[PDB]
Design a protein around this ligand. Structure first.
Ligand SMILES: [Ca+2]
Ligand SMILES: [Ca+2]
Ligand SMILES: [Ca+2]
Ligand SMILES: [Ca+2]
Length: 529
């Protein structure tokens, strides 16, 4: 019989109605909603967030929800009111102990509630860790309301998964007095998910680009050599790649491009290979692949990676570096080595030399073709296809045919073409043998094992030595987890939180194999200019 105080945006009629639904819900008519009383409703027991909502509503911390709390809670939705409330409510979902800070464990447990078994615990811990590292601007290891609002707008931890190092390597730690970089140390850090300093990275990028800028359009490379295909930001598989193909210190390398873009570790692949390039200028060689441009790195996630880690200057620096990448390689005077393949405008090796390479790749022309041309789908069984034909998979440059390749192999006195532009189940692919040489006219090489984490394909590299072209395959390796497009866990989870709380309240109305090559085709295309 004493009146009840509350602060809500409901009018007196709306409160009476909410009261009806409160009473019904209240079975034992104790005037307080209990955890079990909630978990008596048709669709409410299979909602991961009830547990949370109930506990936030419980302002007094007595375990149950009184009518005030109920009305005040529901009032904090359906608000239309200022955006701070929406944010303020969202924050409380994660902050289990109500102390105003989101703990690692807190963030882990709360996510773990809604994600269930769709993620392994090691994976979930990882994305929690990275989200915090980025979001935490004061160093305490927890997320304030302020830090939170910054991110969404635009003991106490579950170990033992390695936590990414806070220390950024300095110029002294990475470079020795003679100028050369410490691949030893670089690798150690990057594999730990560590980062360099914005200064150290920029130095590596530019110091390597300056070496590239001086190499010719068409390299001359001698056997023995290990030839590699696409890498696509799979840094952890690059480590394996080097283990399999031989140490860079005792072995010659030629990479045929695509270092970045489809994988979440592109910047690491770049820093590392660029570091190696400085260290072994005359024995380690990088070509340019179609993905090494401003146009594709904007479209896919590389630009995005550079912003999340480091700065946009690092991106801009890589773009200028990429411009210096050579287009091709004549290997042991037998093999033309190109990322993509031929051009109708490139008849001789001398044609490759006449090209101005220091620019963003044009949308057509010999440059484009070198980087995008693919072979015919039925290359070697051709029936009315001309040498070069409009490539409908890429949407630019040409498809080349077996006669086209054979023709070029004869005119320039070459044995075969090594390229890498198309994923391959076995990590490579040989094509029809030349009528005279008896050796494959064309070879694709692909060095990214288990591509996009789904193709479940083997990788490969070509080891040419003692007049044998040995194809060494390898399976993939573990790597840390990132949510698509380096999304922080809040941005990711919030929408699910939003949808599930609305469902909850609507209880209010109870009165009255590489087939993945098929899925990915869209992204095999040059983006829309
Ligand atoms: Ca009750
Ligand atoms: Ca209460
Ligand atoms: Ca807390
Ligand atoms: Ca903090």
């Amino acid at each position: 019989s004493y009146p009840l105080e509350m602060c809500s945006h409901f009018d007196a009629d709306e409160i009476k109605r909410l009261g009806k639904r409160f009473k019904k819900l209240d079975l034992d008519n104790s005037g307080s909603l209990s955890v079990e009383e909630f978990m008596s409703l048709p669709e409410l027991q299979q909602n991961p967030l009830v547990q949370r909502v109930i506990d936030i509503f419980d302002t007094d911390g007595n375990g149950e929800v009184d009518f005030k709390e109920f009305i005040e809670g529901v009032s904090q939705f359906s608000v239309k009111g200022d955006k701070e409330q929406k944010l303020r409510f969202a924050f409380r979902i994660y902050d289990m102990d109500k102390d105003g800070y989101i703990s690692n464990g807190e963030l882990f447990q709360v996510l773990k509630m809604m994600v269930g078994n769709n993620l392994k615990d090691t994976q979930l811990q990882q994305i929690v860790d990275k989200t915090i590292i980025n979001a935490d601007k004061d160093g305490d290891g927890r997320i304030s309301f302020e830090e939170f609002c910054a991110v969404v707008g635009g003991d106490r931890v579950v170990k033992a998964v390695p936590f990414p190092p806070s220390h950024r390597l300095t110029a002294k730690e990475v470079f020795d007095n003679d100028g050369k970089p410490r691949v030893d140390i670089l690798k150690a850090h990057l594999m730990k998910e560590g980062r360099l300093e914005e200064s150290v990275a920029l130095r590596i990028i530019t110091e390597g680009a300056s070496i590239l800028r001086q190499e010719k359009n068409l390299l001359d490379i001698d056997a023995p050599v290990t030839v590699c295909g696409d890498i696509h930001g799979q840094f952890f598989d690059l480590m394996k790649l080097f283990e399999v193909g031989g140490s860079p210190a005792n072995t010659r390398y030629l990479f045929l491009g695509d270092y970045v873009d489809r994988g979440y570790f592109s910047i690491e692949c770049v820093l590392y290979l660029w570091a190696l390039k400085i260290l072994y200028p005359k024995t380690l060689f990088l070509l340019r692949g179609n993905h090494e441009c401003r146009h594709l790195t904007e479209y896919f996630t590389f630009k995005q990676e550079c912003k999340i880690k480091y700065s946009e200057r690092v991106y801009d620096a890589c773009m200028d570096a990429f411009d210096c990448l050579p287009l091709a390689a004549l290997m042991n005077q037998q093999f033309l080595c190109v990322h993509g393949g031929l051009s109708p405008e490139i008849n001789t090796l001398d044609d490759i030399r006449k090209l101005d390479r220091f620019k963003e790749p044009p949308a057509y022309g010999p440059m484009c073709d070198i980087l995008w041309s693919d072979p015919l789908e039925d290359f070697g069984n051709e029936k009315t296809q001309e040498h070069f034909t409009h490539n409908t998979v890429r949407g630019c440059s040409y498809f080349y045919s077996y006669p086209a390749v054979c023709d070029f192999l004869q005119h320039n006195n070459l044995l075969s073409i090594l390229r890498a532009h198309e994923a391959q189940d076995a990590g490579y692919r040989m094509y029809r043998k030349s009528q005279t040489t008896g050796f494959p006219s064309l070879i694709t090489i692909f060095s990214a094992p288990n591509y996009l984490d789904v193709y479940n394909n083997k990788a490969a590299v070509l080891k040419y030595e003692n007049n044998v072209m040995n194809i060494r395959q390898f399976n993939c390796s573990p790597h840390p987890y990132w949510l698509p497009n380096f999304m922080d866990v809040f941005t990711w989870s919030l929408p699910f939180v939003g949808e599930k709380v609305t469902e909850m309240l609507v209880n209010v109305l109870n009165i009255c194999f590489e087939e993945a090559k098929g899925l990915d085709r869209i992204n095999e295309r040059m983006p829309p200019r």
